Design a protein around this ligand. Structure first.
Ligand SMILES: [Zn+2]
Ligand SMILES: [Zn+2]
Lengths: 170, 550, 340, 370
């Protein structure tokens, strides 16, 4: 009646395992890494991240908020929050061996530009990914954290004897 | 002593007008509003208890207008009765509002009403009816099973939630997500009520499969408060996941570390290591998500102050705790340093991980002279495929205790022909972003100061003014801390220590800085097991007396 | 050991009159003496409560007190319940004094002032009375909240939370009477049956039988009580679901062939009508077809130890009423067609 | 426009109100340059709560697996205008999802130019093409004589947009694509990346030859990690920085706490004697003061006899006991892990104390008896 088959039901079997795999709590991410060593081990030595990476954006429909509102989420804002956090973790662990073309498609979602009730965690994980590619300095206030954090931390670093290192370069 | 009533009589109408809104708070939104504002209600009641305590009832009429109806609305509200001391205070309040010998019938009516609400608070069977009838027949009082009733009730729900978790996407009961969220709004007010630590722990690990969060971060704050104030004690595995779903609770654990280094326990690094190990921040930081969010807030604070010795100290402790908790739970399948420290070659980290306890005292010169070579390779040849620049390789080099600190005290031992390697290294520690002109100038200034100081060591116990000459701009901290090194290391010290201290201690800032330095030296020494007890006892004594002067 | 008896029985008299509405004579002297004696019980409970002949002797005095009062005719006093009720006897007494409306003003004043001085003694060595009434008011509220925003009336009653609880109270209460050996448990179970809400009661028992052992002497007592009294056991098999009784059977096979006997007796009170394709009862209170289909389907959806027994008990019942192989005729034909 | 008089014309140009009382609309709806047949009968009032909407067989096969979406959109949506908006967008989505079936390339540019450019390369180079021509994957050689492959996925307009280049080697390949660039352009960039990274490859080729690489088995080219086996029941894993391969890696050792200590101490002491002018082997041999075994066990390299869920031996007393009834997996599990896992899946069903459901790795029938 209210069965959903898991959103990765229809994928490449190995990925389907990966995404089932990260679902499993914070040690999710290593299970990630163990998964990957146990699939370089098997007959499909390459894992075409490229095939996975498109799929994470493929939009598909939901009716959420009021009784009736059609909206489209890509995979990333649809499959279970903990595979989100544990992907990005793992893509930091494998950042080099990807195409940028796919990644940036993901990150654009991750940046979460104009949504209400955002994925703080994924956004932050975006900023930490863009810094590492070398395409999202952004000239901005675009560092991983909250305004509230950066402010309450400036507030306290003041009440301490500043050092004779020179770290800002005017 | 001026107002007594005025701010309290405003806050009264605010709160009486808020409790009238909630009144047994049988809905979602009434209850969220209750849950947030409850804290301030508790404080209000503390101050109001002082107010009602000092005076007596039925003689006075200050807030006696509607105090009855406020305390009814409060108590019958069970989210109120659930928060830490508010129940206890409302009892205290109601003890004040009693009168021993009634004169007006009203006094006695109220006293009866108070006893009534007390039976209502304590010992009323506001629950499933048949269970009342059954236990009453068995001849039990609520008292002797409520406890048991609660526990079995709780594990019921913990079970329920845990099978929700394992049936991810199965044609079975999916426990109604409203009810998951409903529970967790119940948790919050009695997080500290020991009977429930199974339930809470459950909900932190029984995340399941929604794109959306399904819990209200008012809960995550109420939890994180109690982890950090030691009013819960969960299992560690609870709290790696807790962080790894609601970020103002990871932000807000890391500020609560700063407040220890900053206000309360300035330069007590034993207490800082104890704080770091007690909260599971090393443990959490084994996760390469959580490392990055916390290192980013370290980097924030490094720039807001321009390289504070206090923040340097706390980093060194935490790095130590981190490395030793990463080592523990990381035999099979561990994350790479390009995943914790991404912004330099893992060579440098892999060098700086290797602990000085384990190496001989004489081979520390070799190792530091190698670190200088590799920092110079990375900083000077700032080319593609590397560090992005100097700041990055510095923010790394902070994180290590062992290597960063040994430069000064190795210079003292090798003042005769100081190696250019250590000169560069050291000027770099106390000043990045100089230029080769500024850093070479600093090197040779320090080399000339080594000449005078080596003359004074090879000489007898001499004055403090001869040293203030060579001491006399951008390189003051460098020279000061190198010279403190000399005072504590040389046997010429222990005689004119105070005479140098008084001249150098211009302000309170530099006093606190040297206090931090002395703590860092002691912590550093007791760790690596290297001691000249002279320096140790002397450092501790001077530190002892100067913490009084401030 | 002998010193404790005159202490404890005097406290028990004072506890039972705590409930009672004569409170005019009471004063701070009485109240102070009550709570000092209660402190001493709580003191005893801590000092030589565990692994002593004293413990077992006080339990004889408990159950002797609790059986010579009985709870029949004169006054159904709950009383200080059992050995752990000595560890919070103070609280029971103090709670009863608050619930007496005629509790005198000066006594209540001295009382509440002595229970709740306030936070002057936030530093107290012994986990004190104040803290006990707080953590109660908390649990209470916690329960109430969890009931109305969390609690679910499970359909596997063997996994319910109130049932599970009421069950384990009855099992404690049988274990006590078992070791006392004063009256047989049969008398106790019969007085239950007489007194209380029966419907609720029976689900209790049902859950009781599947609870794993805690110290199943209890379970072995309940099977013998039931089999002794067939009339209540008729309403047991009548009043529950199928799954509950299926598990009752796989666990305690001393019940199986009496309950099969019951169905064997209810099926034989049916007739087919040709207009409506159905067996039906004459009387209103006779199991409808669907009910009996359920219950048999259940016995079959079970371990092999029962399945062959019930299958053969039907096939022998079918041959007995003519081995026809079409419906209209033998109720048991019907069942056996229906179960494929 | 605002009103659904002109906004409906503008946004559904090919929906014609047949009846005067605008109740029957019929004809065409656009999506991705393709027009679909649709006859949408309203009641006598303008209420989609109850309406008829019939489709061509073309449309229904393309809106397979959203039937409920459209049925709910009918009952929830206020106006026809908005309903058509939702339907249009939904078709858009369905075709870009099923992008495999639906191509009309413009051949006169495409299939001709692709053949011209592949001729310009020379006919050793291609290795594969899908029949839909979408995939191609090519070869290039190193000066060493190593084969290196590249996946390209080509769109409707190859020369217009960039072809997506999907590739093994470990640092991101970046391609200066112009519309004036072609296959030989991106091919040149790929040979440039080859000649550049040679050192990193030489290092990893030397390792795979001389030593017992353990965890990756016939390793791919993306691999920076090599779990080397040395002595017995002790391993060292090594991850390398690719641009300065010869430089030190993050190194560490797995095994017995009594065996691992001396090596770690010795590494600490002898690390200043690492030099990036020799090889990783020639530096490890003088730092760790040993020679390595060259496949001490080549056949029984390792079978991770560990959970294959949590990848650990000893979970709370329990050992890897439950296995696969399969020659190709053989993968041990824990009772706890495999129960926790299968309890989720749609395929698995639970008998009395028995659960049949799919092995995680190979998706074959596996049975668990609690
Ligand atoms: Zn396991
Ligand atoms: Zn398998």
């Amino acid at each position: 009646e209210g069965v959903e088959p898991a959103p990765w039901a229809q994928l490449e079997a190995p990925a389907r395992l990966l995404l089932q795999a990260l679902q499993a709590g914070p040690e999710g991410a290593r299970r990630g890494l163990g998964v990957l060593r146990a699939l370089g081990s098997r007959g499909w030595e390459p894992f075409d991240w490229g095939r996975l990476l498109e799929a994470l954006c493929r939009e598909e429909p939901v009716v959420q908020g009021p009784d009736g509102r059609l909206e489209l989420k890509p995979l990333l804002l649809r499959l279970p929050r903990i595979c989100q956090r544990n992907l990005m973790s793992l893509l930091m662990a494998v950042r080099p061996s990807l195409p940028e073309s796919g990644l940036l498609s993901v990150l654009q979602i991750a940046q979460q530009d104009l949504a209400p009730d955002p994925d703080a965690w994924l956004r932050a994980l975006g900023e930490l990914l863009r810094r590492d590619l070398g395409v999202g300095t952004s000239m901005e206030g675009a560092s991983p954290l909250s305004e509230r954090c950066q402010r309450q931390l400036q507030s306290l670093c003041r009440g301490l004897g500043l050092g004779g290192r020179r770290l800002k370069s005017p | 002593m001026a107002q007594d009533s005025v701010d309290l009589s405003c806050d009264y109408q605010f709160w009486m007008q808020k409790l009238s809104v909630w009144d047994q708070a049988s809905t979602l939104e009434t209850q969220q509003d209750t849950c947030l504002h409850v804290a301030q209600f508790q404080e209000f009641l503390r101050k109001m208890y002082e107010a009602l305590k000092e005076m007596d009832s039925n003689t006075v009429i200050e807030r006696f207008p509607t105090i009855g109806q406020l305390l009814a609305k409060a108590c019958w509200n069970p989210f109120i009765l659930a928060y830490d001391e508010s129940q206890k205070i409302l009892i205290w309040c109601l003890c004040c509002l009693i009168n021993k010998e009634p004169q007006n019938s009203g006094q006695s009516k109220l006293n009866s009403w108070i006893q009534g609400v007390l039976s209502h608070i304590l010992s009323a069977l506001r629950f499933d009816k048949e269970v009342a009838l059954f236990t009453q027949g068995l001849g039990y009082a609520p008292i002797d099973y409520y406890p048991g009733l609660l526990k079995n009730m709780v594990l019921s729900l913990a079970s329920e939630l845990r099978e929700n978790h394992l049936n991810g996407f199965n044609t079975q009961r999916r426990m109604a997500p409203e009810r998951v969220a409903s529970l967790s709004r119940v948790c919050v007010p009695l997080i500290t009520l020991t009977d429930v630590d199974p339930l809470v722990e459950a909900l932190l690990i029984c995340h399941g499969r929604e794109p959306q969060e399904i819990l209200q971060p008012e809960f995550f704050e109420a939890v994180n408060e109690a982890i950090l104030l030691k009013k819960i004690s969960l299992p560690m595995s609870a709290v790696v996941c807790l962080w790894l779903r609601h970020l103002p609770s990871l932000e807000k654990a890391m500020l609560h570390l700063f407040e220890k280094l900053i206000s309360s326990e300035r330069n007590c690094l034993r207490r800082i290591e104890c704080f770091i190990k007690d909260s599971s921040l090393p443990q959490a930081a084994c996760h390469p998500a959580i490392f990055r969010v916390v290192d980013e807030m370290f980097r924030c604070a490094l720039l807001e102050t321009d390289g504070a010795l206090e923040i340097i100290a706390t980093i060194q402790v935490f790095t130590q705790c981190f490395v030793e908790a990463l080592e523990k739970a990381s035999k099979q399948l561990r994350f790479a340093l390009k995943t914790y420290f991404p912004y330099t070659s893992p060579s440098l980290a892999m060098v700086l991980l290797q602990d000085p306890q384990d190496i001989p005292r004489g081979h520390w010169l070799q190792t530091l002279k190698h670190i200088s070579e590799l920092l110079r390779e990375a900083v000077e040849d700032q080319t593609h495929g590397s560090c992005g620049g100097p700041f990055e390789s510095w923010f790394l080099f902070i994180h290590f205790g062992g290597w960063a600190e040994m430069v000064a005290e190795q210079l003292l031992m090798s003042a005769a022909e100081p190696p250019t390697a250590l000169l560069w290294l050291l000027a770099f520690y106390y000043g990045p972003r100089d230029g080769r002109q500024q850093r070479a100038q600093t090197m040779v200034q320090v080399k000339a100061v080594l000449g005078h100081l080596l003359a004074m060591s090879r000489s007898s116990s001499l004055s403090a003014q001869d040293l203030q000459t060579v001491a006399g701009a951008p390189a003051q901290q460098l020279i000061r801390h190198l010279l403190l090194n000399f005072l504590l290391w040389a046997p010429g010290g222990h005689t004119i220590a105070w005479d140098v201290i008084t001249l150098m201690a211009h302000t309170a800032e530099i006093t606190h800085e040297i206090i931090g330095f002395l703590d860092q030296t002691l912590y550093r020494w007791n760790r690596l097991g290297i001691e000249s007890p002279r320096s140790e006892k002397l450092a501790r004594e001077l530190l002892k007396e100067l913490r009084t002067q401030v | 050991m002998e010193s404790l008896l005159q202490h404890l029985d005097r406290f028990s008299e004072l506890l039972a009159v705590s409930s009672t509405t004569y409170v005019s004579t009471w004063d701070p002297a009485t109240v102070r003496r009550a709570l000092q004696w209660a402190r001493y019980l709580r003191h005893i409970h801590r000092r030589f409560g565990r692994h002593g002949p004293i413990r077992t002797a006080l339990e004889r005095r408990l159950h002797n007190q609790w059986r010579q009062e009985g709870g029949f005719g004169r006054g159904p006093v709950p009383g200080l319940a059992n050995f752990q009720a000595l560890g919070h006897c103070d609280v029971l007494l103090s709670l009863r004094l608050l619930e007496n409306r005629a509790l005198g003003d000066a006594a209540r004043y001295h009382l509440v002032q002595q229970l709740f001085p306030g936070p002057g003694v936030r530093d107290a060595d012994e986990e004190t009375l104040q803290e006990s009434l707080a953590r109660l008011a908390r649990r209470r509220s916690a329960v109430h909240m969890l009931r109305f925003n969390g609690y679910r009336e499970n359909p596997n009653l063997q996994e319910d939370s109130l049932m599970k609880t009421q069950a384990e109270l009855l099992l404690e209460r049988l274990q006590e009477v078992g070791k006392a050996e004063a009256e047989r448990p049969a008398r106790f179970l019969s007085s239950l049956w007489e007194r209380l809400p029966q419907n609720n009661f029976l689900k209790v028992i049902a859950v009781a039988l599947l609870q794993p052992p805690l110290s199943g002497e209890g379970s072995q007592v309940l099977v013998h009580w039931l089999l002794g009294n067939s009339e209540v056991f008729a309403a047991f098999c009548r009043a529950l679901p199928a799954g509950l009784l299926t598990l009752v059977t796989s666990r305690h096979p001393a019940l199986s062939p009496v309950y099969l006997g019951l169905l064997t007796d209810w099926g034989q009170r049916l007739h087919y009508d040709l207009q409506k394709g159905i067996w039906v009862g004459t009387e209103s209170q006779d199991v409808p077809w669907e009910e009996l289909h359920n219950r048999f389907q259940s016995l079959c959806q079970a371990p092999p130890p029962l399945k062959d027994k019930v299958l053969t008990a039907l096939e022998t019942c079918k041959a007995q009423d003519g081995d026809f192989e079409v419906p209209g005729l033998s109720i048991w034909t019907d069942l056996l067609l229906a179960l494929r | 426009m605002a009103v659904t008089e002109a906004s409906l014309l503008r946004q559904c140009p090919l929906l014609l109100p047949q009846n005067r009382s605008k109740t029957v609309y019929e004809g065409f709806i656009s999506a991705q340059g393709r027009d679909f047949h649709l006859r949408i009968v309203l009641p006598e009032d303008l209420q989609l709560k109850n309406a008829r909407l019939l489709c061509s067989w073309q449309l229904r096969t393309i809106l397979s697996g959203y039937h409920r979406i459209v049925q709910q959109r009918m009952q929830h949506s206020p106006d026809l205008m908005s309903f058509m908006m939702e339907l249009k967008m939904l078709l858009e989505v369905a075709l870009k999802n099923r992008q495999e079936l639906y191509a009309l390339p413009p051949p006169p540019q495409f299939y001709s130019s692709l053949i011209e450019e592949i001729g310009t390369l020379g006919w050793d180079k291609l290795v594969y093409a899908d029949t839909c021509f979408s995939t191609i994957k090519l070869k290039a050689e190193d000066a060493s004589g190593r084969e290196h492959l590249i996946t390209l996925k080509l769109k409707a307009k190859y020369p217009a947009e960039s072809p997506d280049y999907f590739v093994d080697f470990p640092v991101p390949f970046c391609a200066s694509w112009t519309p004036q660039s072609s296959l030989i352009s991106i091919y040149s960039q790929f040979l440039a990346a080859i000649e550049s990274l040679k050192a990193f490859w030489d290092v990893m080729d030397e390792i795979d030859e001389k030593t017992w690489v353990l965890e990756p088995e016939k390793p791919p080219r993306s691999a920076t990690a090599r779990r080397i086996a040395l002595g017995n029941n002790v391993s060292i894993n090594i991850e390398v920085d690719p641009r300065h391969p010869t430089m030190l890696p993050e190194c560490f050792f797995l095994g017995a706490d009594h065996v691992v200590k001396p090596l770690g101490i010795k590494l600490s002491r002898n690390i200043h004697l690492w030099d990036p002018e020799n090889s990783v082997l020639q530096n490890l041999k003088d730092v760790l003061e040993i020679d390595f075994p060259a496949r001490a066990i080549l056949e029984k390299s390792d079978f991770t006899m560990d959970c294959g869920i949590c990848y650990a031996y000893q979970l709370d007393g329990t050992i890897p006991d439950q296995v696969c009834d399969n020659s190709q997996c053989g993968q041990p599990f824990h009772q706890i892990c495999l129960y926790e896992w299968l309890r989720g899946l749609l395929t698995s069903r639970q008998s009395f104390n028995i659960i049949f459901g799919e092995c995680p790795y190979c998706s074959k029938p596996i049975t668990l008896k609690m």
